[PDB]
């Protein structure tokens, strides 16, 4: 399970979305990904690191993972819908309107590689985009 393309790699985030990771942590993810661990094992380390964070650390990471998943959403749903989601947000769409937007937007795609990210990042992105609620 290696997404060979180097566009949505964890390296691609290390100085951006995932820069809040410590070197030992980064090198941990690198070690796993390099040793042929599944991306979902990376999803699990980072989500663990995420939940174990601190005051501004968590807030910052959350915000950074948002941008990360935003770039994924830039892929899966396209500029089009990610724009509608971003504008909805700015226009005062609540966490639910984004929830009830996002679910239809990420439904209406149905392109295979994109639905990979829907399955991949979708659930975890909900805590990240923390639109989850309750």
Swiss-Prot record:
Disulfide bonds: none
Membrane-traversing stretches: none
Lineage: superkingdom: Eukaryota
Protein name (record): ABA-1A1 repeat unit
Source organism of this protein record: Ascaris suum (Pig roundworm)
Gene name of the record: ABA-1
